[PDB]
């Protein structure tokens, strides 16, 4: 009903492109982009909106004079006339204005720090039905005003920017109980053994195996649940509510065409009943939607979740590498109300890095493959600055800790370093980078060389 600090919300409009409610939600990228863009929510039945790069945390809601006083150096409820510290839920960065242009307008994006008036956002409602100083609730559209630039959060044409004109902004809650299935969570799947997807050098990894061993702990066994319910998508999971399913590691979607097989496909193939899956307590064919965070229905380690597609009514079981291929059977065995275990935060964080890692380098490799032609002279599709920006971030992401750290903290930073090296090993991303060393060892400085001017420093 109400909005406090540490809530999970999104920002959305429907940009009217020739009488079309273009349902665009705000999405910064992070770890490879300091800029922001939009994600379509219009064709959510067939084109799945991403969510994890779109949610936000209201870290604080202070007044004006208190913020200016603290700038000289509980769960507080939202009030119109307060400056808030918005924070990207995935990247951990804070939403701020940027000093670039895409007019005296300004760009928006994330940043590392939190000081300065860039990351601060005072709120004003553009509706006479409510007024200043009172509480902000669900469905309260507003104008969000910058503090540094003193501009409004402008939506342009498609430019999310900071200009001297205003645009309304819908706010929809996502979430607000430990040991329970929460929407958007990343989780393992206990089988004996666990559900797994095959390793790299691909198949295009599109098959499905059941396996125990070290790859249960390791990268490929990661699953982020997503519902079709756009608002309140971080609510507590109950039985029979609809799920899509995106694979975390490969960046694909677990789709089902019972005509062919269990499919591992992209966004646009993942339609409604291509992948509408649910969970049941028994294996029989016996709510629908709640405007809240709901009740905690399913536990983690003590749970019997029977997977079933809505569109075909089948029940997933193994067949008879350990290749017990999970196929949507009509009945299956009694080993299909499986058990769960969630993963942790930096585990999910690196996993979300990896599928954003490969989509740069594959455009970097094929960008070089287009320049591997004797005469192409038109392949502009070759990232440079997005490579270098993501490169220092990954350099920073594996930065060893200093000697000016307490030893208990330094182990945890070291233990964070070890696991994050281990996931890149059993993804074999070194070999992905190793191919970029091949395709950049051609010249001594290249191409039309003005864009490729940092060809020395990129290689170092």
């Amino acid at each position: 009903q109400f909005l406090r600090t540490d809530d999970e919300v999104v920002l959305q409009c429907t940009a009217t492109i020739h009488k079309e409610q273009q349902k665009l939600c705000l999405a910064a990228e992070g770890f490879g982009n300091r800029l922001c863009f939009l994600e379509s929510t219009s064709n959510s039945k067939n084109v799945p909106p991403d969510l994890s790069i779109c949610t936000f945390v209201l870290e604080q809601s202070l007044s004006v004079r208190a913020l200016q006083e603290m700038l000289a150096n509980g769960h507080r409820t939202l009030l119109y006339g307060h400056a808030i510290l918005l924070r990207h839920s995935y990247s951990g960065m804070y939403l701020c204005c940027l000093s670039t242009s895409r007019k005296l307008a300004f760009d928006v994006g994330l940043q590392e720090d939190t000081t300065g008036e860039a990351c601060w956002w005072t709120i004003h409602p553009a509706s006479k039905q409510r007024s200043e100083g009172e509480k902000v609730r669900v469905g309260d559209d507003l104008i969000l005003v910058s503090v540094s630039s003193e501009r409004y959060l402008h939506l342009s044409y498609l430019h999310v920017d900071a200009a001297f004109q205003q645009t309304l902004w819908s706010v929809a809650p996502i979430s607000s109980a430990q040991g329970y299935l929460i929407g958007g969570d990343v989780l393992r799947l206990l089988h004996g053994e666990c559900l797994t997807v095959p390793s790299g050098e691909h198949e295009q990894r599109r098959t499905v195996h059941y396996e125990g061993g070290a790859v249960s702990v390791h990268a490929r066994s990661l699953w982020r649940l997503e519902t079709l319910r756009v608002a309140w998508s971080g609510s507590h999971i109950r039985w029979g509510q609809p799920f899509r399913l995106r694979h975390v590691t490969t960046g694909k979607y677990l789709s089902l065409m019972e005509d062919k097989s269990l499919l591992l496909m992209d966004k646009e193939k993942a339609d409604v009943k291509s992948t509408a899956f649910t969970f049941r307590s028994s294996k029989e064919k016996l709510r629908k939607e709640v405007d809240g965070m709901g009740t905690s229905e399913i536990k983690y380690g003590d749970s019997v979740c029977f997977i079933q597609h809505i569109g075909t009514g089948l029940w997933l079981t193994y067949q008879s590498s350990i290749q017990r291929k999970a196929i949507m059977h009509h009945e299956g065995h009694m080993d299909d109300g499986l058990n769960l275990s969630r993963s942790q935060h930096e585990e999910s964080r690196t996993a979300r890095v990896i599928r954003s890692t490969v989509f740069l380098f594959n455009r970097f490799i094929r960008g070089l493959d287009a320049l591997s032609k004797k005469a192409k002279a038109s392949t502009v599709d070759l990232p440079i600055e997005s490579v270098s920006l993501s490169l220092q971030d990954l350099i920073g992401y594996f930065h060893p800790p200093d000697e000016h750290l307490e030893h208990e903290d330094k182990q945890n930073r070291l233990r964070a370093l070890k696991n994050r090296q281990n996931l890149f090993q059993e993804e074999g991303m070194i070999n992905l980078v190793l191919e970029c060393i091949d395709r950049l060892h051609v010249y001594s400085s290249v191409a039309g060389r003005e864009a490729g001017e940092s060809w020395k420093s990129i290689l170092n």
Binding site: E150, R151, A163, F164, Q165
Partner: peptide, 26 residues
């Protein structure tokens, strides 16, 4: 009086130095 009018002049817009020389001949 200075701050209040220029905050209004974000809300309303009104090449500037480009068309300035265009008035020198026209």
């Amino acid at each position: 009086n200075a701050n209040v009018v220029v905050r209004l002049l974000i809300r309303r817009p009104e090449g500037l130095l480009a068309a300035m020389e265009e008035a020198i001949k026209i």
